[PDB]
Amino acid sequence: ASMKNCVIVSAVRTAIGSFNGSLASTSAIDLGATVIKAAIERAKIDSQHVDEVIMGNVLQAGLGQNPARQALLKSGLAETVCGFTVNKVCGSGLKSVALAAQAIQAGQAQSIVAGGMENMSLAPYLLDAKARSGYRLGDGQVYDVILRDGLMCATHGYHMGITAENVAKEYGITREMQDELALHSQRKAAAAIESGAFTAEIVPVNVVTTFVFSQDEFPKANSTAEALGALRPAFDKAGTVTAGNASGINDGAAALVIMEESAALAAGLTPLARIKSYASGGVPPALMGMGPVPATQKALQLAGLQLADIDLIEANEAFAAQFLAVGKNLGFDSEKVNVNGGAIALGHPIGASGARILVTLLHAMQARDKTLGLATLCIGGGQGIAMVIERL
Amino acid sequence: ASMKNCVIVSAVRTAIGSFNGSLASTSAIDLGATVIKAAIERAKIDSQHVDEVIMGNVLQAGLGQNPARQALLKSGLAETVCGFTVNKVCGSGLKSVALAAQAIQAGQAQSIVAGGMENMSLAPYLLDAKARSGYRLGDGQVYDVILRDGLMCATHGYHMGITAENVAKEYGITREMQDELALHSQRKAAAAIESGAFTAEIVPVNVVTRKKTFVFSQDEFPKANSTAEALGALRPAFDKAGTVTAGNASGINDGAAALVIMEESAALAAGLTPLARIKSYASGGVPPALMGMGPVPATQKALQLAGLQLADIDLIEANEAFAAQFLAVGKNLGFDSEKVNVNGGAIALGHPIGASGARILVTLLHAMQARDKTLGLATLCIGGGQGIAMVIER
Amino acid sequence: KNCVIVSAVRTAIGSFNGSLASTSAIDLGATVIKAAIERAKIDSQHVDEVIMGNVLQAGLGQNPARQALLKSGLAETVCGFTVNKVCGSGLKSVALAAQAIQAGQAQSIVAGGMENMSLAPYLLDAKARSGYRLGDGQVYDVILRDGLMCATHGYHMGITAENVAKEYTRQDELALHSQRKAAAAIESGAFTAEIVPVNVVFSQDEFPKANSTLGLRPFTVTAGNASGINDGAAALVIMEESAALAAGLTPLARIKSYASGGVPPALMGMGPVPATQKALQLAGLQLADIDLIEANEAFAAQFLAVGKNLGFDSEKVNVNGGAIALGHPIGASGARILVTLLHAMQARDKTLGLATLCIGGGQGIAMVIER
Amino acid sequence: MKNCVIVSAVRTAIGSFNGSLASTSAIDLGATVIKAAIERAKIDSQHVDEVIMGNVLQAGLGQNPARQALLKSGLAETVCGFTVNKVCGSGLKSVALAAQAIQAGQAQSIVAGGMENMSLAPYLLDAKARSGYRLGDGQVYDVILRDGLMCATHGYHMGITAENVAKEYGITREMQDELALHSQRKAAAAIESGAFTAEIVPVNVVTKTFVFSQDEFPKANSTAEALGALRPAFDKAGTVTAGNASGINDGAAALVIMEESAALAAGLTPLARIKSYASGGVPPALMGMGPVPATQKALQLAGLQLADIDLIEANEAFAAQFLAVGKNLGFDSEKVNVNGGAIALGHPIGASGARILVTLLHAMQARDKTLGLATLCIGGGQGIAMVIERL
Ligand SMILES: CC(C)(COP(=O)(O)OP(=O)(O)OC[C@H]1O[C@@H](n2cnc3c(N)ncnc32)[C@H](O)[C@@H]1OP(=O)(O)O)[C@H](O)C(=O)NCCC(=O)NCCS
Ligand SMILES: CC(C)(COP(=O)(O)OP(=O)(O)O)[C@H](O)C(=O)NCCC(=O)NCCS
Ligand SMILES: CC(C)(COP(=O)(O)OP(=O)(O)O)[C@H](O)C(=O)NCCC(=O)NCCS
């Protein structure tokens, strides 16, 4: 058979919650269900025609069987609709869209909802297996699942923040450079929020514990260079990486309806963009922040494009250090990158972020009438993922 | 571009450990690494040519970032080799192979190692989020991750064993029928083990502990001397008025499995020997309360995609999560029992949830080779009301 | 032998997660032990033992009373032990000091109690130690498991109060009365003599609710007509009478009698009835002979039922307010009330005093002192 | 001042860590011995004035373990009780308090002793669990260590205090292991001859179902070579091992204590008079030496010299400490722990003080001896001692 084209028919996200903030009482799965339902609605697709739901979720501990299937059931899709959960750490939410596109290209499905979901506020604490076989005698530890499964390197046993220090040293990214980038991201985020630039892409969340959450709350609107400069290093007393020039711990979800192109058109739907290419890359775990380099190079190669052809870029700001090193390595035109701000200001709900940046990318392309877009993120464990899309 | 054909070039598993048994000190990720390394070795592929590793794993709690990538790094593959972890509950290990096939069919890769890994003995316990925000005043709970994330229905709040009771009632599968099936699976397993039928497909695991060092290479969950009378004397495990017992249900187990999957022309160019072509795969959804019936829509769709009727299939691995569910699926679809689980099933062998989907595919292929059969079906039910199926061809 | 009180001191009582929430029970105990010694003017080298009540001993380390006495500056040759008779613990400790002195086994003891309910830990069951294996477990709030829940019936002390209320109405009038009396006592400086400051300088009871509002919701009994969860300590120096006089010390009161009583766990609030009857009998007294009474206000319901049963003259009871306003640091309260009782007797020049409190598990304890 | 007599004395067999009593709560063990002490004394149960029980690991055991134990034993709800914590001294302190109350005429009949189930001790999440961990790992604390076996002053194990004493008194590994073997041999000989049969009350254990009536911590088949091959338990350069230290154990013990005239008026048989008791303090770092001042004081109170004592139970928390105490006081070793000690029998901390008193009295009876001393060291730098006179 011939490979088929995949188009994005809707793209939506929740506002991103701060750690213990507005979404801290809404489960990852409920956040996923909200975005799945909204993506369906915004696509105008017949919900009975969804073939699969594919959601990224990193801190799956205690969330119950196959969080993606729970989210799809909660969204109102029929019990005949399949789904599965993806874990590629910070790449999860984009990998899920890549997998949806692959299934469609391969003619194995026609319509898939894909994205990701994370509630880091609600992540549990863990007793290791010794609790099951018996501690017997002597003290034990109670493990923060955010760190154990999300933010600590499983190869080296130190924080993602330490990998950022590793990259800063390897690429000569100073504290000053990192804090300047941070402030820039804050400023762009604040400008985007004030101008209503996120209004189209956000689906409100009703929080009943009662209020509507519809505005990204991680941005530090009173941010100043002097304040950023006064912060202490967060991970190494002699370091450059701080809470001010790193992304946060956050809650949120994002989802998109992906369809085979001819099927979308036959159903009378409006394709918003075509998925042109996607790819993953691997790097050393200690330099995980550089993952977007091989992933982006491969995605551009698969797309037949050069980096200069790309009109807009979302390159996730896990850490200013890594964001900058990736930029210097690849030679990004900074004016094209994270035009509405990035995760330093907006937050990093890890299993959702890959889909989140793709949503933001597409809407920013629409708003600015741009043709080609690149989304990429670094991935704990030494990986990266990238996707190229073409409006409309 | 055009769609490509995907072949299996190797297929391997660990022996399956009992709960707190021989693999109880060997992490899921280490079990995954062992099978990845062995699948690569057995395929004779150049290890530098692996494009991705895709592994199933259900109980990811506390295992660290992206268990699959950990396992691939531990296997000795280069840091440039990507990977990710899949969770479709009991379907995970077969879904991983399906995804590897799809990627190859779509021309996105040429060579993938896929399968699954689970160590249920080492699953942790959880404090819920109240521990993070503060319990304040009043008691909390401590949650068994096997149950919360593996064996309890997230829709209904009751065990997979209760979904089996549901199916038994809906399909008229009695205690007697269930125990007769159990005894059959025990018998077939025992025969296969003793005769060496699993020798080819198993990679030994070296187990090193303070108190002992040894090589684990024989499935240890089977219950020799299982008898109809003994099985009949067991108490129901999940409902005091029920039919499902520990004797007619699979276990909680540890193990891993993996296969090397390749684009056909690439395999032949490398002088490698394709063992089977992946003909089709599919997933199906059913009500969560009847999750045990998942294999019905998944099998129907896979057969349709393959252009086959069920009768065309020579050998079938239909996972025995519960005798009740296995039997109802068999009755619904009309399985020829002589074709099914010819070397025994999970009631005897065990059910390491994130690995089983790949485990049964390994077993299926080796049984097809041994018996010179052309078409095979692997299918499993999936907690949450799903099923997954794959058709392969020698 | 005769036993006398030579000093009596307490900390101000802290609110749950309030001013004393960072100060360990043992550091609170050490403060009151040191202060009792100082106020008594006794040679510290002559202390024979320290006896301290403490209910939530979980995770506090070996023998909290000994830790507290060492922290107070007493020599390592000074022995001590920890008592648990739930809410009775602090008074039981004094009764035990008196008994030892009466029996000529000691001449000078510091006794009282200490509790920090804010700092109480959470517990995994023993199944954690032997292994959960399969299936969920529970994580237990030690305030509830060891302090506030009935070990016979598995329900709150608050439910025993509902039991008593039904046996003997929506309590709020009594609550307001206690608040008013407490506020008056505090503002006028009535607690100044009995309180030792704690440098965290916390020196004023913070649980009172000025401007109370009561008429909410009920676990009916409400938070407004029940005592609180609280932190504090109290201690007294107790001596053999002739020794105190020979050393040039000033006796403040004689301990005339003490007793403990048992009742059904479900009606534990009524414990003070048999304890009081027995203590009065032992003292050769009738209730009417008592000038001032401290009857702890664990719950308005229980306090009122005890009052109606025994026939307390309400004008004589908790004259500076009670635990509904002041709080209820469980292992310390028994000693805390005795401190308050003595100082109130001194201020009003009264001769005979009764202190009594109810005890989870269906007990009571009472003490009669003579100024 | 009135005279106080022991009218019964009983104990459970001592369970090993995670052994035969590991499913039987401290409180249930307490109730068993309270009921049995009452039965063996032939007292009218309605005449019990109080129950006083030692228990060190009270964490999670519920309001006032002693009162729970008395209620479970079948005593009326009018019978008061309270729980005593003097670490390893708790069980003997409970008897001393019973005697004191009786001497002071505040009671006539008290059941006293102690109870501990170290197997069932819980783990703790600290107060951070109540306010919220927020972000970052925490710890889970073994209550046996935190509340039982670690020094609250120095933050190191009781085993380290034993290393401290060994150094201070020149007690070598060789000396410690020789004492350990002796205790094992004596315990094995006692068990073989039925010497503990009179003092033990069986426990029915229902899980399999069985009757536990024999001390299971002794290592019959113990040998010098085996003991010598053990690694130090607490300090990689140390002398103290699991073989020359007592264990972590489960058990309970209780005695009926009465005013002498009341016992005789009730037609009961006094078994011994409590002659004196005393507690002593020493530095926390040298807690193992507690029995020195406690014993000296108890003898002085009794008007006796050490040589007047016929039989001695001196608890074997650690061979190092036991030997140092012996050398300091000048014990006649032939008089000490004649049926073995805690190195063989175990050390259920809140019960051991009462346990050794029970063993003492029955050994005195079996050997027709007149004067007996029971003494133990106490974590935190204390000791306690009691002198009794048969009969
Ligand atoms: C010393 C310690 C920590 C040992 O406990 P554990 O760590 O459980 O060690 P155990 O498992 O009992 O013994 C360690 C080894 O010594 C061995 N052992 C002990 N006594 C032995 C003997 N008499 N003959 C042969 N082997 C012996 C055990 O068999 C064990 O070997 P395995 O691992 O092969 O089974 C001990 O139980 C303890 O803490 N005792 C002191 C209690 C205390 O401090 N009480 C308060 C006093 S103030
Ligand atoms: C620890 C800090 C750096 C700062 O958080 P704190 O709560 O300690 O500090 P404040 O937010 O209270 O200022 C931060 O939230 C953090 O963890 N950053 C890294 C999270 C992150 O970006 N993870 C992706 C890995 S690629
Ligand atoms: C509860 C039993 C039946 C038996 O385990 P136990 O440890 O309780 O049994 P014993 O070893 O005492 O016989 C069993 O381990 C079990 O849960 N089996 C089902 C596992 C299962 O539900 N797998 C997923 C199916 S879709």
Tab-separated table of N, CA and C in Angstrom, chain A residues 1 3 52 60-66 69-70 79 82-85 87-89 95 102 106 108 121-127 129 132 144 146 148-150 152 154 160 278 280-284 380-383, chain B residues 1-3 52 60 62-66 69-70 79 82-85 87-89 95 102-103 108 121-127 129 132 144 146 148-150 152 154 281 283-287 383-386:
chain	number	residue	atom	x	y	z
A	1	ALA	N	0.834	-1.249	0.000
A	1	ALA	CA	0.000	0.000	0.000
A	1	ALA	C	0.857	1.283	0.000
A	3	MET	N	1.874	4.848	1.657
A	3	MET	CA	1.813	5.630	2.933
A	3	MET	C	0.784	6.764	2.788
A	52	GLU	N	-8.397	5.451	18.317
A	52	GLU	CA	-7.469	5.229	19.413
A	52	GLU	C	-7.140	6.518	20.104
A	60	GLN	N	3.179	7.659	36.496
A	60	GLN	CA	2.036	6.788	36.442
A	60	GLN	C	1.774	6.126	37.795
A	61	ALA	N	2.730	6.215	38.701
A	61	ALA	CA	2.563	5.586	40.061
A	61	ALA	C	1.248	5.897	40.760
A	62	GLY	N	0.479	4.848	40.976
A	62	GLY	CA	-0.744	4.920	41.699
A	62	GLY	C	-1.919	5.476	40.968
A	63	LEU	N	-1.772	5.719	39.684
A	63	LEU	CA	-2.828	6.320	38.900
A	63	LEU	C	-3.842	5.320	38.417
A	64	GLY	N	-3.567	4.055	38.624
A	64	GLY	CA	-4.441	2.979	38.179
A	64	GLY	C	-4.103	2.458	36.770
A	65	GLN	N	-4.726	1.356	36.392
A	65	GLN	CA	-4.480	0.678	35.089
A	65	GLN	C	-4.514	1.648	33.918
A	66	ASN	N	-3.407	1.738	33.174
A	66	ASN	CA	-3.347	2.372	31.819
A	66	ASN	C	-4.055	3.748	31.835
A	69	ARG	N	-6.307	5.037	28.954
A	69	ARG	CA	-7.609	4.411	28.757
A	69	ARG	C	-8.593	4.963	29.749
A	70	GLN	N	-8.109	5.227	30.936
A	70	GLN	CA	-8.984	5.887	31.931
A	70	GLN	C	-9.419	7.273	31.453
A	79	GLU	N	-16.543	2.545	25.168
A	79	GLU	CA	-15.671	1.492	25.670
A	79	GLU	C	-15.004	0.648	24.559
A	82	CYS	N	-9.969	1.986	21.911
A	82	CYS	CA	-8.727	1.617	22.561
A	82	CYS	C	-7.803	2.738	22.916
A	83	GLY	N	-6.910	2.465	23.858
A	83	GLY	CA	-5.877	3.436	24.165
A	83	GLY	C	-4.732	2.866	24.983
A	84	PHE	N	-3.618	3.603	24.999
A	84	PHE	CA	-2.460	3.149	25.730
A	84	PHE	C	-1.637	4.332	26.117
A	85	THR	N	-0.776	4.098	27.099
A	85	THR	CA	-0.028	5.156	27.718
A	85	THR	C	1.393	5.061	27.331
A	87	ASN	N	5.458	6.385	27.815
A	87	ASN	CA	6.455	7.010	28.692
A	87	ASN	C	7.812	7.097	27.978
A	88	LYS	N	8.120	8.296	27.469
A	88	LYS	CA	9.431	8.679	26.937
A	88	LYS	C	9.853	9.927	27.749
A	89	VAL	N	9.722	9.870	29.108
A	89	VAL	CA	9.920	11.015	30.026
A	89	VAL	C	9.349	12.309	29.391
A	95	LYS	N	5.862	12.130	21.599
A	95	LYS	CA	5.987	10.796	21.091
A	95	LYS	C	4.610	10.221	20.824
A	102	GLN	N	2.151	7.923	12.887
A	102	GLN	CA	2.710	6.704	12.297
A	102	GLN	C	1.627	5.675	11.988
A	106	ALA	N	0.715	4.523	8.210
A	106	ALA	CA	0.685	3.126	7.932
A	106	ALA	C	-0.714	2.524	7.603
A	108	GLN	N	-3.216	2.065	9.585
A	108	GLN	CA	-3.750	1.215	10.655
A	108	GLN	C	-4.881	1.937	11.421
A	121	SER	N	1.801	17.784	41.066
A	121	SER	CA	1.333	18.059	42.448
A	121	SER	C	0.791	16.873	43.178
A	122	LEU	N	0.141	15.978	42.449
A	122	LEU	CA	-0.510	14.818	43.001
A	122	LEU	C	0.352	13.573	42.953
A	123	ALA	N	1.612	13.715	42.564
A	123	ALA	CA	2.494	12.566	42.551
A	123	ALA	C	2.697	12.047	43.961
A	124	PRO	N	2.692	10.706	44.110
A	124	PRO	CA	2.774	10.110	45.430
A	124	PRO	C	4.171	9.991	45.958
A	125	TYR	N	4.260	9.453	47.198
A	125	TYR	CA	5.510	9.051	47.797
A	125	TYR	C	5.534	7.527	47.869
A	126	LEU	N	6.734	6.960	47.866
A	126	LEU	CA	6.907	5.558	47.661
A	126	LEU	C	7.763	4.843	48.694
A	127	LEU	N	7.261	3.669	49.112
A	127	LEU	CA	8.022	2.753	49.956
A	127	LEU	C	8.556	1.714	48.990
A	129	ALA	N	10.340	-1.877	47.537
A	129	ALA	CA	9.917	-3.220	47.675
A	129	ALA	C	10.182	-3.814	49.045
A	132	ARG	N	7.255	-4.626	50.967
A	132	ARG	CA	6.465	-5.783	50.611
A	132	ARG	C	7.032	-7.068	51.213
A	144	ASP	N	10.144	10.371	46.958
A	144	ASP	CA	9.326	11.304	46.207
A	144	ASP	C	9.291	10.805	44.738
A	146	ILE	N	8.099	12.159	42.023
A	146	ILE	CA	8.549	13.192	41.084
A	146	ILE	C	10.044	12.995	40.814
A	148	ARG	N	12.151	10.341	41.814
A	148	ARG	CA	12.573	8.959	41.441
A	148	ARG	C	12.242	8.614	39.999
A	149	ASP	N	11.023	8.945	39.549
A	149	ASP	CA	10.540	8.514	38.214
A	149	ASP	C	10.539	9.608	37.125
A	150	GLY	N	10.723	10.855	37.549
A	150	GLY	CA	10.569	12.007	36.701
A	150	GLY	C	11.840	12.815	36.512
A	152	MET	N	15.128	12.619	38.372
A	152	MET	CA	16.463	12.128	38.647
A	152	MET	C	16.927	11.226	37.523
A	154	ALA	N	18.335	8.106	35.928
A	154	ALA	CA	18.366	6.763	36.379
A	154	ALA	C	19.734	6.113	36.138
A	160	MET	N	18.197	16.053	36.912
A	160	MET	CA	18.222	16.692	35.553
A	160	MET	C	18.940	18.031	35.588
A	278	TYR	N	8.864	13.381	11.815
A	278	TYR	CA	9.193	13.287	13.244
A	278	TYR	C	10.349	12.360	13.419
A	280	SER	N	13.345	10.779	16.763
A	280	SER	CA	13.954	10.752	18.093
A	280	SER	C	15.432	10.617	17.907
A	281	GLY	N	16.180	11.131	18.880
A	281	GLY	CA	17.606	11.018	18.899
A	281	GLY	C	18.119	10.639	20.268
A	282	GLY	N	19.299	10.055	20.293
A	282	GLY	CA	19.907	9.678	21.574
A	282	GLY	C	21.253	10.362	21.792
A	283	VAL	N	21.516	10.739	23.045
A	283	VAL	CA	22.754	11.353	23.466
A	283	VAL	C	23.155	10.741	24.828
A	284	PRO	N	24.350	11.067	25.329
A	284	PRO	CA	24.635	10.529	26.641
A	284	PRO	C	23.655	11.037	27.698
A	380	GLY	N	15.041	13.218	29.619
A	380	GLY	CA	15.836	12.565	30.632
A	380	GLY	C	16.190	11.150	30.199
A	381	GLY	N	17.425	10.789	30.442
A	381	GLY	CA	17.938	9.509	29.977
A	381	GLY	C	18.789	9.637	28.744
A	382	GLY	N	18.940	10.855	28.254
A	382	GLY	CA	19.738	11.113	27.066
A	382	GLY	C	19.025	10.933	25.767
A	383	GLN	N	17.850	11.556	25.605
A	383	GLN	CA	17.144	11.445	24.368
A	383	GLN	C	16.541	12.818	23.955
B	1	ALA	N	6.260	7.200	0.079
B	1	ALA	CA	6.912	5.840	0.074
B	1	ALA	C	5.873	4.702	0.125
B	2	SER	N	6.303	3.472	-0.153
B	2	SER	CA	5.437	2.293	-0.053
B	2	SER	C	5.581	1.666	1.362
B	3	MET	N	4.539	0.978	1.829
B	3	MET	CA	4.596	0.126	3.042
B	3	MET	C	5.570	-1.042	2.848
B	52	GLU	N	15.789	1.238	17.606
B	52	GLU	CA	14.941	1.569	18.786
B	52	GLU	C	14.748	0.308	19.599
B	60	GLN	N	5.425	0.636	36.678
B	60	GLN	CA	6.582	1.533	36.490
B	60	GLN	C	6.936	2.273	37.757
B	62	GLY	N	8.393	3.800	40.761
B	62	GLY	CA	9.689	3.775	41.404
B	62	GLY	C	10.796	3.129	40.619
B	63	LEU	N	10.516	2.717	39.400
B	63	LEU	CA	11.564	2.113	38.546
B	63	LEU	C	12.537	3.099	37.891
B	64	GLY	N	12.241	4.389	37.998
B	64	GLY	CA	13.116	5.440	37.415
B	64	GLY	C	12.694	5.833	36.011
B	65	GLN	N	13.294	6.903	35.501
B	65	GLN	CA	13.004	7.409	34.157
B	65	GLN	C	12.982	6.368	33.087
B	66	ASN	N	11.834	6.223	32.401
B	66	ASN	CA	11.705	5.494	31.166
B	66	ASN	C	12.402	4.128	31.236
B	69	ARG	N	14.453	2.570	28.277
B	69	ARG	CA	15.749	3.152	27.933
B	69	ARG	C	16.786	2.641	28.901
B	70	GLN	N	16.411	2.516	30.159
B	70	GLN	CA	17.327	1.948	31.125
B	70	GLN	C	17.746	0.554	30.702
B	79	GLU	N	24.338	4.725	23.451
B	79	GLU	CA	23.474	5.795	23.938
B	79	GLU	C	22.707	6.493	22.815
B	82	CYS	N	17.588	4.976	20.691
B	82	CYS	CA	16.412	5.440	21.388
B	82	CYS	C	15.540	4.330	21.960
B	83	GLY	N	14.706	4.697	22.938
B	83	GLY	CA	13.701	3.747	23.403
B	83	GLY	C	12.602	4.368	24.240
B	84	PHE	N	11.532	3.645	24.410
B	84	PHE	CA	10.421	4.132	25.245
B	84	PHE	C	9.622	2.989	25.781
B	85	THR	N	8.835	3.284	26.822
B	85	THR	CA	8.094	2.302	27.572
B	85	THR	C	6.626	2.421	27.263
B	87	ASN	N	2.655	1.186	28.141
B	87	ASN	CA	1.710	0.611	29.111
B	87	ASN	C	0.311	0.468	28.495
B	88	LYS	N	-0.030	-0.787	28.135
B	88	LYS	CA	-1.412	-1.196	27.730
B	88	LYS	C	-1.743	-2.395	28.659
B	89	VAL	N	-1.481	-2.234	29.965
B	89	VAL	CA	-1.675	-3.312	30.983
B	89	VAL	C	-1.132	-4.655	30.503
B	95	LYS	N	1.816	-5.170	22.459
B	95	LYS	CA	1.602	-3.817	21.854
B	95	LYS	C	2.995	-3.253	21.429
B	102	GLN	N	4.789	-1.643	13.115
B	102	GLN	CA	4.251	-0.501	12.486
B	102	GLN	C	5.344	0.494	12.029
B	103	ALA	N	6.322	0.735	12.876
B	103	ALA	CA	7.360	1.692	12.581
B	103	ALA	C	8.137	1.242	11.375
B	108	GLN	N	9.976	3.989	9.074
B	108	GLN	CA	10.607	4.903	10.039
B	108	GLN	C	11.788	4.260	10.733
B	121	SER	N	7.083	-9.133	41.986
B	121	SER	CA	7.615	-9.296	43.343
B	121	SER	C	8.233	-8.047	43.939
B	122	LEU	N	8.815	-7.214	43.073
B	122	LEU	CA	9.524	-5.997	43.501
B	122	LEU	C	8.649	-4.753	43.366
B	123	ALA	N	7.344	-4.899	43.089
B	123	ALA	CA	6.500	-3.752	43.011
B	123	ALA	C	6.434	-3.087	44.419
B	124	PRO	N	6.446	-1.772	44.439
B	124	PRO	CA	6.425	-0.997	45.688
B	124	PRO	C	5.041	-0.747	46.231
B	125	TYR	N	5.013	0.004	47.341
B	125	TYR	CA	3.805	0.441	48.007
B	125	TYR	C	3.814	1.978	47.885
B	126	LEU	N	2.638	2.596	47.938
B	126	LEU	CA	2.510	4.044	47.844
B	126	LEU	C	1.760	4.699	49.009
B	127	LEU	N	2.268	5.861	49.436
B	127	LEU	CA	1.479	6.827	50.188
B	127	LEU	C	0.798	7.698	49.141
B	129	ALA	N	-1.149	11.223	47.603
B	129	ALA	CA	-0.730	12.614	47.547
B	129	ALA	C	-0.905	13.336	48.827
B	132	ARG	N	2.208	14.247	50.514
B	132	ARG	CA	2.940	15.403	50.017
B	132	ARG	C	2.410	16.733	50.501
B	144	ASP	N	-0.869	-0.934	47.641
B	144	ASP	CA	-0.126	-1.982	46.981
B	144	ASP	C	-0.165	-1.661	45.496
B	146	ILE	N	0.890	-3.362	42.824
B	146	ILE	CA	0.360	-4.477	42.021
B	146	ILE	C	-1.158	-4.316	41.852
B	148	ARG	N	-3.192	-1.519	42.665
B	148	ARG	CA	-3.671	-0.251	42.220
B	148	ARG	C	-3.439	-0.036	40.746
B	149	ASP	N	-2.226	-0.340	40.298
B	149	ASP	CA	-1.784	-0.005	38.914
B	149	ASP	C	-1.821	-1.220	37.937
B	150	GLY	N	-2.023	-2.405	38.484
B	150	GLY	CA	-1.964	-3.647	37.732
B	150	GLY	C	-3.250	-4.469	37.708
B	152	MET	N	-6.423	-4.093	39.749
B	152	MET	CA	-7.741	-3.574	40.087
B	152	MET	C	-8.300	-2.726	38.974
B	154	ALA	N	-9.956	0.237	37.215
B	154	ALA	CA	-10.051	1.635	37.561
B	154	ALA	C	-11.468	2.181	37.408
B	281	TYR	N	-1.986	-7.071	13.095
B	281	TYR	CA	-2.212	-6.886	14.508
B	281	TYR	C	-3.388	-5.930	14.659
B	283	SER	N	-6.038	-4.007	18.097
B	283	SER	CA	-6.526	-3.922	19.444
B	283	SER	C	-8.047	-3.741	19.405
B	284	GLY	N	-8.699	-4.162	20.460
B	284	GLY	CA	-10.194	-4.101	20.574
B	284	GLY	C	-10.565	-3.608	21.943
B	285	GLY	N	-11.741	-3.030	22.035
B	285	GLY	CA	-12.285	-2.550	23.311
B	285	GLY	C	-13.611	-3.170	23.640
B	286	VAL	N	-13.816	-3.430	24.936
B	286	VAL	CA	-14.990	-4.060	25.485
B	286	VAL	C	-15.301	-3.372	26.811
B	287	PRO	N	-16.461	-3.669	27.371
B	287	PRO	CA	-16.694	-3.081	28.675
B	287	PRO	C	-15.702	-3.528	29.738
B	383	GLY	N	-6.812	-5.589	31.186
B	383	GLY	CA	-7.554	-4.820	32.183
B	383	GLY	C	-7.954	-3.447	31.698
B	384	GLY	N	-9.174	-3.038	32.031
B	384	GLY	CA	-9.735	-1.766	31.496
B	384	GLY	C	-10.662	-1.981	30.303
B	385	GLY	N	-10.802	-3.242	29.864
B	385	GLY	CA	-11.721	-3.597	28.816
B	385	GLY	C	-11.096	-3.533	27.437
B	386	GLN	N	-9.943	-4.165	27.264
B	386	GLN	CA	-9.279	-4.155	25.958
B	386	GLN	C	-8.751	-5.530	25.632
